[PDB]
Each structure stands twice: as structure tokens, then as C-alpha cells.
Symmetry: C4
Subunit: 369 residues, 4 copies
């Protein structure tokens, strides 16, 4: 049965640990892929860790946008190895989601001025879209959001240090049925983390151009969209300045570059995931701002430690567990964090939102390099 | 269908070998996890060996309560390897059971003063409970017991060398529905081995404080409990003194520290599993005491050798095979023994109760260190 | 349900990347088979990469027609390894296809003057045919074509540098029910790539004797056949001369030897897959000739790059995805290319025909030797 | 559905290659078990290679009747590895068969004077029988034979160089329901190869005491048995004298010791599998004797080469494919051969009887030692 996606996020007060792969630690001896940009997507039966591999192993002489990059998946928490990983697509930029019937995999490959997104439904090539600006077509590097048998994704074409072009897609059974170009002057959208919420999609993305706060785009199934930035003074990007009075135009201070991230909107409140360090990808924390989606103050209520500030963090993205998998009355919000080591590989940890009792700690990669 | 758990243990006269993993012997060359605290739990379809990994392999650089510890499972008798193990939870103390529909996994992680038990039903986080004494929340390190779609576990919070706090839990579909704190002054319960018996749960645990005999707690589905110590003069813990007149309270002689163990109650009789050595974790034996549950004499009837006294034993725990898996009219009692080697890893052997003819022997780890 | 095979190939304008295994790159460290002559065949559920192994691993001291050669299969895109490969048959020449119910595997083994093809249906030996010319009985080294519960293959017996004997087979449930010897004087058929098309089978093969263009044979379910060569001046074999005015008699210029290849017939048009180099197995390209099946000119319309001319290509063959797997109204044409390295092993890439936007690129093996 | 086992062996004229694992060749680099006494048994869905492991890998320092020996299974033709093998039982002597519903596994372990056979049905311990002569209880080391939901096996207790005791067992759902001790003075039965034939079981075994011809026992479902020796002058054991006039009793010339073997009875005819060398386990051949079961001449009709006389053979045993798996009207006879190398390990090849065209060849182990 197709996932309805019409329930809301039930509110959470903390984040409980879900999975830890320990990829690099086992890969010191075992045959483990060198992976980057991992993400997690859940079927109605199981959750899977998707990853991009260079076709190389840890402690091997073969270890950015190469032809050898492929998208592969393993069950969540298992090591990415050649002996247990399922092939998905050829991709140096990817997204994957399950609409309740079959997996949808989007894989981008080709040259930087001629990249094509390859859409695969149940492992079958169903649609393609070529680059329309001819400057590195790229996508979420996290799970797409599916509502009522239709899955949605955001792709960016253009420069990564100036104004680019951003498109929203509606995908049904692997076929693109509607596309809308976002009219967003002076905005920058990269590597969006999208989730379904009450038959609508909310995406929180990365401003690589001039934004230390995170831009967002929210749209319905007809791709009627609204855009903006998260107005919290708790800035979500990395690099970023210190917490001051925020703004939701793009905040230019330390706004150049960034990191893939996520946020969960709860009315006017927001759950913010960000690095602990303001200049590097070190540490991670979950911050609840009761008015952060629209208010410009730097006041928050709940802070949960995820990764300690002396340990390497990296990309982070959102994923959801639908009621068809949980049996609950809501959509449970969850997130993964990539712990980059270095070759250059990463391990992943995942957390899920609960209203029950939690604790902050540090779950780092912990491999002696 | 949910496991009824209303039949009794049918009586057994011996123990037949069920599984042997040979983890360390294969891991001298193959890619095998360094595991500790293994245990076995059975679904209506298959039995699985659960284990805690440090995220490291045998003969590796990376090889107690660390953030990298995870609970993983393999089919029974297979080697714990990164290429065949299913991830279960992040845990340095764990319990797992199957209610007949889905696996329930309990995983404890976090700091020693802030540990939280994470309950997972069908891989979905369903409930959590924080440490309530803030001194190392810990659980069975063996399978929980399930009766009529509800699974039961015992957790300990407090010191491991004095009086602590002990709680019983009723868990339905991964949700805690009832908790009772055990009023047990001058008792110590650690690492309980629980089994279902005639719609009731019987747990035999480890007295780390001042007991060389094993304490027990038995409760119904409403958590109405009775407590006591195994009165047999055949003392079940390690370390222990020589077999003398036992007591129905804690026997203080060599009562400090201990080892995880099990016992099967048969009316006033008891099947006792214990180490052969009275001072170290060497050897194992199964002893049938026809009046050992309530009588203080050191007389027994049947002794079966399991592990020879020159070979390394360790933790031991009980597990059961329900009529839904066996097709029988009773609940078959079974047990595993961990053979600790050393890194520090262990291999596991498992035995099941039969009424047919058996033999005592030695099935040790057999690796060359 | 048996595959109908009565729909036609829907026309395609480009080829989208489907799979990439990166076998040699992972095999620099991991346990990966040394494979040759790979091919891909699809079930109604999944596509599988079939391959022949010498029973040896990459970077191993054990690494043409040997008794140790076996046919093995993995899911498409996964590495050929001893820990994930399914055994199929003992074969130094093989073909495999799925009729919609079960896999049919044809495996040829034995001495060069006494070889026998072993037919296996659902892993069960169902029929055999011995060599009738006693000079290396051999078969497609690609997927057989199945129409209406009956699968078809072409086998060659005789010399590889002169006139040989060629037979067509009808195989139902692994049993040969009809055979016809092709009356083809001055023709040479080796390693045919066969596909179903409107309840008919079209095979494009390799002329090792005196042909730089590719011969073809097309037959119905009663094995009533027509034969000929591809009249295009775009010659499809390797080695070959430069593109000039071609013919569909055998073109003798550089006609000696050859390489396994494929072509897709579209009325009087043809999609031609060939190496970029005219003297060696380097590079690959997809060429659309609107009148190439019957016209002798060297004019074409669409050229798509697949493998760059500085990179190693090799065998190439056709495979199809039936409507029972895609849900479409047509049979989607697809193809694989073997990238030979060196031991002597190869990695595989696969492409499928789409009517949407594509791009040419180079997806080479990429292992540093 | 339970296998009927009431059809006869349909006659065959040759043997076609079924599987080849190449375990030692891959195990020169990969993680492959050191195995001995392999055999093959088929479910209604698939055939599996069963094997005994010392708990050690090829090229490892850990590499007869040890406690570490276990019975393990893989799909047929796949390498015996720790990452793909299913655990079956703890055994240094074993038998396994599928009655059409579940696997039955018989595993013998314990000391030489106290060994017990452990019967496992669907992985559940269902019955045990201890040694009754206290001199190495042992069993077929090949598949048991199942007729009408009941499986049959032959076990030997006593000396391997004199008169011993032999018992027939009827096993239904893993439970022994009838046992008969064979009254066979001056006979020796070791390592029987049993097959079903027209609701009856025929076993051909090894005379280790004083027989260079193979003894046989045939019984119905009520264990009413007849005994004798294969009267053919083509002697089936190894060591053996040259082919001369045979006898219906044990032939004392080179009768001491022997090797596990098989024969298929066809009325008064017999298909005989034996080594090519008369003094060592080198080579293998399939010999059809039209009157060999009762006639004492050394004349035969069909000889098929299996393993060349310069290559290492070893144990050989029979297995069958029932009509529930093949869909045929008869029971197809099949056999495996163990190719012993050396550590001391072996690979396996398997053949099945067909009435179509075959060829003799040599499929040896092929590893460089
Ligand atoms: C470090 C400076 C450059 C930078 O940001 N690189 C980004 C990145 C990272 O680790 O940050 C990792 C990804 N491999 C990049 N994705 C692609 C398609 O290449 C990504 O780049 C995107 C998104 C901003 C634009 C092309
Ligand atoms: C000899 C070291 C002290 C000691 O007894 N350690 C125990 C132990 C062992 O192998 O004995 C193994 C476990 N890893 C311990 N469990 C935890 C949560 O740490 C356990 O400790 C528990 C139960 C007594 C109390 C915290
Ligand atoms: C360059 C060596 C001669 C040659 O052409 N070899 C061919 C080949 C190649 O890679 O070209 C690979 C295959 N292993 C060969 N197949 C067999 C059954 O041996 C094949 O040979 C066939 C088809 C022409 C005739 C026997
Ligand atoms: C040459 C050594 C003596 C000998 O014959 N060994 C036999 C053997 C072999 O490879 O021949 C292999 C098996 N491992 C033996 N089985 C057991 C239970 O030990 C078997 O022995 C059996 C059957 C005769 C009697 C105990
Ligand atoms: C969502 O849609 C389903 C059917 O797809 C319906 O049964 C359900 O009531 C809806 N849920 C909400 C919260 O509106
Ligand atoms: C246990 O309960 C089941 C239903 O769950 C019932 O059919 C059965 O009779 C009960 N068994 C006993 C021994 O009371
Ligand atoms: C092919 O045959 C199927 C039944 O096997 C039929 O339903 C279908 O219409 C046919 N398709 C075409 C294109 O003729
Ligand atoms: C064997 O028994 C089955 C039922 O189990 C019956 O249908 C069949 O006819 C029998 N076969 C023979 C050859 O007697
Ligand atoms: Ca930024
Ligand atoms: Ca104690
Ligand atoms: Ca040619
Ligand atoms: Ca003999």
C-alpha cells in the first residue's frame, strides 16, 4: 500500500539512538567500502542505509564526481561491505525513497556540464532529466519525501558560490509528472533535507553562497511553494558566527560555504541540528527553539548533545518513519549524522524522535587513524 | 500468533548439545567480531545468537561500557561476522526476546550516571526509561521472557557491591505498561536469567554483593512477586566455597562478586548450571538437585559434564523453546555458556533439555592463543 | 506467469547507465572472483549478472576451456565474490535466461572434441546435447531469448576460422523440443546476442572467419529462419576497417577474428554497438543508423559515447526487460559491456534504452594495474 | 507435502555434471572452511552441500573425532565459508535428509565409548540415541532416505576391523519410531549410501573388515530387511584386487580397510561408482554392469570417466532428486565425489543420471599445493 503521508509529526522532546555502524573500526581489518554522503530511508518493512562509494575499500590503494561512484544500500546499522551491499545506481549525487510499494532511486552521473539524473523505480530505469544549466546538476544526498504514492525531491543546477537554479519534482512510480522552477532570487539551496508533514513537504537546505542560516522551501502536491530562511538566532550552518540576533533573509556573516543539514518545523518552533563548532565539522547537537522558525532571538529551551566537540561530525539529514511502518498515529522524525574520517570515508549514526526519556552523550566514530 | 507461554517446563533428565560457533578459531583468520556477553533467543521460526560487539575484529588494532558497543544478532551456530550479522541496537547492556510476532530488543547506552534503556520493537524505537538511581542501569544480558503477547525483564540500578534497586517490567509491543520496584532488602540481583513457566516468570540472578548462592524472583503477569535464594548446598555462583549446608538467604562465604548464571525450578527441585572451579570461571556442569530449591542439604542426583575444568567457561544463561516452535506440549528448557578467551572475546555453546539419553563431555573453545 | 514476448521493442533515442560493478577495483583488496564473459539476464523480479569463473580470486596464484570453469550469478551491480555468488552450472561456454517461471541455464563442458551442453531448469538437469561436429561446441555467452514459455538459443560447432555448423534450439522447461541446422554457406556465426521482438527472435553474432560486419539470423517459434549480414557501412566488429561503403555479404577486409557484439533492429534501421578502436578492444559507442540494416551507406544519425577510446572494452551483448518486469507496453532493449583487464579478468557496465534525455561519457574499469 | 518416494529409479545411461565448488582453489586466498566428509541432500526447493568442519579455515594454523567438529550446509556448488554456511549440528559423524516438510539432521558427538546421535528436526532437538556397543557410534556420512514422511538411516557400533553391530532406524518428524538390529554375521557395514526406490530403501555400504566388494542391505518401511554383497566381479571398494570372478559374499583379497561408496541397483543390474586406482583413492569411474548385482562375472557394458587416475578422489555417496523437485515421474539417481587434498580438506563434484548424451572427462580439484 502507498504511504499516505497525511499525518503530522508528533511532537518530540528528545532523540534516542537508533543505529551505529562503526564502519571505519571494522574496516581496519575487514573488507569495508570507503563511503561518503550516507543517508537512511525506510521502507514499510525496514530502514536501509544508502551510501555513495568510490568503488574502493578501506586500507586499499584505490582509496569527487568520478564515473566509478555508485549508490549502494545495506540494512541500517550494518557495515557497508562488498559482500552485503545491494547495488542501487551509478551516481555521484543521489536520493532514494520508498513510496510504500517500491524503492525509488535517483542517481546523477555524467560530466559536470552534461550531468543527467537517472530515476530508477524497482531497479528499472523509468525517467531521466538532463542538466538544464550545465553546471553540476545535484540533488538532496538524503531521502526524498513521499506523500500518497508520489515522491518529491529538490535539485540544484548552477554555481555553488552564487545564484543558481532550483527545481521541485513530483515523481510517481519513477516517472516525473510535474516540475516547477523555484523563483528564489538571492537564495541558495543545496542538499535539501525533505520530510512529509500533513500531506505537505518541508525541505531545509544549505546556503553555500551567503547564508549562515538555513533556507527552507515548503510545497504541497501541486508544487505550490513558499520559501524563506529559518529566522532563529541559533544559526544552523557550518561555518557560522556566534549565536546573536538572527535574521531570515540570508545571514552573510560566515555565510560562504556550508554543510548539509536539516531542521524539523513544529508550528512556529523548530528542532535544529547543527555542529557544535562554529568553524569546523566537529560535534553535533539537537536544539529546540520554541519560536525559532519565525522569531529572530537566540533563545532556546532544550539542547541535547549528540557528538562531542572534540570528535569529527559532518553531513546530517532528516528521515522519517511513516505510520505504515510504526503503527503509530503520526510521522516520527529521525535524523542521521555522518562522522567523516580521514582515503576519506565516514561512519553514520542515527537518532529518532521520542516523547520519552533521553540522554545526551557522544557516539563518535572512534577509529584510531 | 503471540506465544501463549502457559504450558509448564516438561521435565528433562539430561542436556543435549545444540550449537557451537567456534568463533575464535575461525577468527584467527576470518573477519569475526570480538564479542562478549552472548545469549540466544528463539523466534517461532528460528533461534538467534545475540551478542555485544566493541566494533572490532579478532586480530585487529581496535581489539567496558563504551559508546561504540552495539547489540547484533546472527543465526544460531554461525560465526559473528560483519558480513552476516544483523544490527539490533546500540547497547553495552542488552536483552532481546520474541513475543511470537516481532523481536523486542532492549538496549542500554549512555553515561554511567545517565544511562537510558532503549526499547525497540520490530526495529522501531517504542519506549525508553532513564536510570533512576544514576548508578549504571543494567539488564539481563540474556533473553527476556514472554507470556501471552507480553514480555518481562528485570533491570538493576545502583552499586554492584552493596544494596541496589531492582525493577520488574511488563512490555507489550515494545511499550512499558507496568513497572514494580522490588522490595528486597539485603538482596542483590544482577544479570537475571528469566524463563516463562505456566503463565509465570521465574528469574535466577547473580548476587555480586554477599551471596555465593543464587537469588531468585518469580512473578505473574501483574508483577506480583516473591523473592528468595536457592537453598541448595550446591552453590551456583563463582566464586563460591565448597559444597556444604546451604541457606535460603545469601551465603556470605565467597559471596563477593559472582558470575551470570541460571537455574531451572522443577517444583521443589532445581537444575543448577555452574562452573566446575570454585574460584575461577573454568569448566561447567549441570546438576539436578531433587530438593535444592527449598532444602539446605548438599545432596544431588544427576551431574552432567559440559565444559572440562581445564577449559575456560564464563557467563551462562537460560533460554526456552516454546510449543509454537517445537510443536510439543511443553516449554523446552535450554541454556548457553560463554567460553571467554583472552583482546577479550568469547565463543558460545548451547544445550537443550531432553528426556532421552545424553552424555557428558567437554566442548571448549579450542583456539590457540 | 510465462513471459509473453509478443510486444515489440519500443524505439529509444539514447542509453542510460544501469549498473557498474567495479569488480577489479574492489578485488585489489577484497575476495573477488577472476571472471570472464559476463552477461546479464533479467527475471520478472530482478536482473542478475552471470559470469564464468576459473575458480580463482583476484591477487591469487590460481589466477581457456578448463574443467574448473563454472557459471555463477550475482545480483546486478554487485561484485562477483565467493560469499555472494550463486552457483549455476559447470561451463566454459554458457547461456542463461528466465522464461517467467524459472531460470534456464545452459552449460557446455567436456573436451574440445567431446563437449556436451548441459541444460538446467530450476537447477535441475533436464536435457543434454553432445557436440555433433566434435570441434568445440559453443553458445551465446549472453542471455537466451524467451517467447511464450519457450526459450531459444544458437550454438556453433566447428572451426573458428572457417566454415562451421550452426543450430537453432527451442527449449521449453529445460527440454529441447525442436532443433534446426542453419543452411548458411559462406557465413560464420559465433557468440550470438539474441533478443525477442514481436513473438520472433533476432540474433546478431560474430563472424570470426571473414567478416568485419555482423551476421544475423532471425527466426520464429517454429525455427523458420532468415539469415544475412548487417548492410551498414558502419562496421560492427573488431577488428574492422574504416567506415566506407559497406555490404551485407561478409566484408573480408579485416574480417578475420572478431569480438562478441550485438545490434538492435528497428525496421530498416539498426542500433549498433561497437568498439571505438578499429584494431583493438578499446572504447565503446552506440550508433543509430536509420537505414543500416538494409542500406550500404556509412551515414548515421546518433552517436553516443559509452567507453572512451583510451580505456579497455571487450565483449558486449544484448539483454531485454520484458513488460512483466517493467509494467510497460513494450520490450526495453538493454546491453552490457565487458571491460577486460590484465590474471585476466573483466568488470561489467550495463545500459538500457530510454526515449528521454541521455549523455555520453566514459565509465571505465578504473583499476590501477 | 511429504515426499512420497514410491516411484522407481528411471533408468539412466550416463551421468551429467551437476556442481563443482572449487573450494580449495578459492580458499588459497578466501576464507574457506577446511571440510571433510561432504555430502549433498535435496529439498523440494533446492539441493544443499552438507559438510563437517574442524572449525578452521584454509591457510590457517588451526588447520579425527574432535569436540569442535560441526555439521554445516551451503547451497550446492557454493564455497564452504563462514560467511555463507548455515549451522546444522555438532557432529563428527552425520547424516541429513529432507522429508518434504523440514530438514532432518542427525549428528553424532561425544567420546568414542559414549557417543550419542543427536536428531534435529527443523533445527529442534527431537530425539537422541546413545551408543549401544560403546565403540564409536557412526552413521552414513551421506543423505538419509525418506519415504512417505518417514526417513531411514543405518548406524554402526563396534570395531572397524572386525565384527560390529548394525542398526536400521525409522525416523518420523525427527523421532525414532522403530529400530531393528541387523543379524549379519561375517558382514561389515560402514558409511552406507541409502536411496529410496519404490517405497523401499536400498543401502550400499563399505566393508572395512574383509571385503573388497560392497555389502548391501535393503528394507521396507517396516524394517524387514535382506542383506548381501554385490556379486559383480567389478569390485567397488578401495583397496581392491584386479577385476576377476566376484562373489556374493565378502571377497577377502585386499578386503581390509575401504572407502565410502555407493551403487544403484537396477533389477539384476547395477551402476557401480569406484576409484580408478585399485590401491589408492585416485580417479573415479561410473560402471554399468547389466548383471552385476547377482552375477559373478567381471563383464560390464558402459564405463564413464569421472576423475582421471592421476588426480585425487575420495569418499563418494548417492543422493536422489524426488519427483516433487523435478516434476518427473521417477526418482533421478545422483552422486557426489569428494576430492581430498592435503591441513586436510576436500572439494566436491556432483553428477546426476540422465538418459541423454554424456561425456567422460576429468573434473579434479585443481589446487596447487
Ligand atoms: C568543500 C567545498 C566544496 C563543497 O561544498 N563540496 C560539497 C561536499 C562537501 O563535502 O562539502 C561534498 C560533495 N561531494 C559535493 N557534491 C558534489 C556533487 O560535488 C558538495 O558540493 C556541492 C554542494 C555544496 C556543490 C557542487
Ligand atoms: C570484573 C569486572 C566487574 C564486573 O563484575 N563486571 C561484570 C562483567 C563481568 O565479566 O563480570 C561483565 C559486564 N561487562 C559488566 N556489565 C557492565 C554493564 O559493566 C558486569 O558488571 C555488572 C554486573 C556485576 C555491574 C556493573
Ligand atoms: C583470441 C583467442 C581465440 C578466440 O577468439 N577466443 C574467443 C574469446 C575471446 O576472448 O576472443 C573468448 C572465449 N574464451 C573463446 N571461447 C571458447 C569457447 O574458447 C572465444 O573463442 C570462440 C569464439 C571465437 C571460438 C572457440
Ligand atoms: C584411515 C583412518 C581410519 C578410517 O578408516 N577412517 C575413516 C575415514 C577415512 O577417511 O577413511 C574418515 C572418517 N573420519 C572416519 N570416521 C570416524 C567416525 O572416525 C572413518 O572411520 C570409520 C569408518 C571406517 C570407522 C571409525
Ligand atoms: C490519511 O489517509 C488515510 C487513507 O489514505 C485515511 O484513512 C486517514 O484517516 C488519513 N489520516 C488523517 C490523519 O487524516
Ligand atoms: C494455553 O493457551 C492456549 C491459547 O492461547 C490454549 O489453547 C491452551 O489450551 C493453553 N494451554 C494450557 C496447557 O493450558
Ligand atoms: C501478448 O499476449 C498477451 C497474453 O499472453 C495478450 O494479453 C496481449 O494483448 C498480447 N500483446 C500484444 C501486443 O499483442
Ligand atoms: C505415489 O503416491 C502418490 C500419493 O502420495 C500417488 O498419487 C501416486 O500415484 C503414487 N505413485 C506411484 C508410481 O505409485
Ligand atoms: Ca553557509
Ligand atoms: Ca556472588
Ligand atoms: Ca570479424
Ligand atoms: Ca574393503
Amino acid at each position: 500500500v502507498k504511504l499516505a503521508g497525511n499525518s503530522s509529526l508528533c511532537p518530540v522532546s528528545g532523540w534516542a539512538p537508533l543505529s551505529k555502524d562503526n564502519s571505519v573500526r571494522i574496516g581496519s581489518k575487514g573488507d569495508v567500502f570507503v563511503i561518503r554522503e550516507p543517508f537512511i530511508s525506510c521502507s514499510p518493512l525496514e530502514c536501509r542505509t544508502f551510501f555513495l562509494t568510490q568503488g574502493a575499500l578501506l586500507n586499499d590503494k584505490h582509496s569527487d564526481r568520478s564515473p566509478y561512484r555508485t549508490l549502494m544500500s545495506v540494512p541500517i546499522g550494518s557495515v557497508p561491505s562488498p559482500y552485503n551491499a545491494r547495488f542501487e545506481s551509478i551516481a555521484w549525487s543521489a536520493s532514494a525513497c520508498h513510496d510504500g510499494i517500491n524503492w525509488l532511486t535517483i542517481g546523477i552521473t555524467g560530466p559536470d556540464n552534461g550531468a543527467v539524473a537517472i530515476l530508477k523505480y524497482n531497479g528499472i530505469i523509468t525517467d531521466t532529466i538532463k542538466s538544464w544549466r550545465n553546471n553540476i546538476l545535484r540533488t538532496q544526498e538524503s531521502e526524498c519525501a513521499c506523500v500518497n504514492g508520489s515522491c518529491f525531491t529538490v535539485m540544484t543546477d548552477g554555481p555553488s558560490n552564487g545564484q543558481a537554479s532550483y527545481k521541485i519534482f513530483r515523481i510517481e512510480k519513477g516517472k516525473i509528472v510535474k516540475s516547477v522552477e523555484m523563483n528564489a532570487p538571492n537564495y541558495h539551496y543545496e542538499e535539501c533535507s525533505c520530510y512529509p508533514d500533513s500531506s505537505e513537504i518541508t525541505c531545509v537546505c544549505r546556503d553555500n553562497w551567503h547564508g549562515s542560516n538555513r533556507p527552507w522551501v515548503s510545497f504541497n502536491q501541486n508544487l505550490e511553494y513558499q520559501i524563506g530562511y529559518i529566522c532563529s538566532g541559533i544559526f544552523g550552518d557550518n561555518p557560522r558566527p556566534n549565536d546573536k540576533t538572527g535574521s531570515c533573509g540570508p545571514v552573510s556573516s560566515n555565510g560562504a560555504n556550508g554543510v548539509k543539514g536539516f531542521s524539523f518545523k513544529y508550528g512556529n518552533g523548530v528542532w535544529i541540528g547543527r555542529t557544535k563548532s562554529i568553524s569546523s565539522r566537529n560535534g553535533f547537537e539537537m536544539i529546540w527553539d520554541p519560536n525559532g522558525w519565525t522569531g529572530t532571538d537566540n533563545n532556546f529551551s532544550i539542547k541535547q548533545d549528540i557528538v562531542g566537540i572534540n570528535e569529527w561530525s559532518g553531513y546530517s539529514g532528516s528521515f522519517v518513519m511513516h505510520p505504515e511502518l510504526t503503527g503509530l498515529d503520526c510521522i516520527v522524525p529521525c535524523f542521521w549524522v555522518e562522522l567523516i574520517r580521514g582515503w576519506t570515508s565516514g561512519s553514520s549514526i542515527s537518532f529518532c524522535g521520542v516523547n520519552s526519556d533521553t540522554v545526551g552523550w557522544s557516539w563518535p566514530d572512534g577509529a584510531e587513524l
